[PDB]
């Protein structure tokens, strides 16, 4: 497993929107989707560290609501020079995205618990 | 001598959290924290002495790190009153009616800023 020192997660965007069935009728029913992409920062050849920002963009559709947004985090991968994200395995992409999904999971549980006056919705992915 | 209200569950239409983008706002307009609350006659039961009212809160909260915005509604069934227009409400009646909307925005903002900034949650006082 890949060794990573991570900076503080950054919440670019988190939107909670009640579903509007009329909007959906005009623009389509939204579909739950997660996409992890990357912004390369640098390689440090001397240190053998690659710094890259991992970026999670999401739309999560449930009965009453749609949640959408983007979370990101700077990652400093130790003992690894990487030139492009096509070089990451599925496990590695999952590893780099794990803290991002967890922020989404945390925000969603708390927001839904208050908004729907119910126990918070717990996303499993 | 207070107003007797039976309320439906608060309805969160929109609650939006966006990281502050100072590049954009600088020529697109810098926002102020503000709330607007309005009240709408939904209907009546004048035999039962009841006015049903929709309270709607629209809000923007600006801090260094973020803009939060959205719209919260609640249905309120006012007992023992037959209101013809919303301006009949007194300041304390409006305060009463708006309070649960503001408390929702307060709770949402605390949990979200607590998680987003990882730093003690922002506690709004209106």
């Amino acid at each position: 497993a890949m060794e990573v020192i991570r900076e503080q997660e950054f919440v670019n965007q988190y939107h909670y929107d009640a579903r509007n069935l009329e909007w959906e009728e005009e623009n389509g029913t939204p579909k739950t989707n997660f996409e992890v992409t990357f912004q390369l920062a640098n390689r440090d050849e001397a240190a053998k560290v690659t710094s890259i920002v991992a970026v999670l963009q999401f739309v999560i559709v449930r009965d009453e609501f749609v949640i959408s947004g983007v979370i990101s985090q700077m990652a400093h991968i130790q003992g690894r020079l990487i030139n492009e994200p096509s070089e990451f395995s599925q496990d590695e992409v999952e590893n780099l995205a794990a803290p991002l999904l967890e922020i989404v999971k945390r925000l969603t549980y708390e927001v839904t618990e208050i908004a729907l006056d119910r126990p918070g919705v717990t996303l499993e992915f």
Side-chain angles (χ1 to χ4, degrees), chain A residues 92-106:
Chain A
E92 284 169 347
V93 166
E94 286 168 2
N95 169 351
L96 295 162
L100 309 180
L101 291 156
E102 178 61 36
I103 293 291
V104 178
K105 186 175 181 184
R106 288 255 57 224

Side-chain angles (χ1 to χ4, degrees), chain A residues 45-105:
Chain A
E45 284 78 19
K48 211 168 171 178
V49 181
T50 302
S51 308
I52 194 155
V53 183
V55 175
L56 179 67
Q57 178 257 309
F58 55 94
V59 178
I60 302 157
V61 190
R62 291 290 184 272
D63 283 27
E64 300 285 314
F65 65 78
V66 186
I67 287 158
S68 56
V70 184
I71 317 303
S72 59
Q73 184 182 46
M74 172 68 76
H76 307 282
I77 305 162
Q78 308 300 301
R80 199 72 199 276
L81 295 176
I82 287 145
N83 281 278
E84 62 195 349
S86 66
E87 297 176 76
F88 293 133
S89 76
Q90 295 176 122
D91 286 355
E92 284 169 347
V93 166
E94 286 168 2
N95 169 351
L96 295 162
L100 309 180
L101 291 156
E102 178 61 36
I103 293 291
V104 178
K105 186 175 181 184

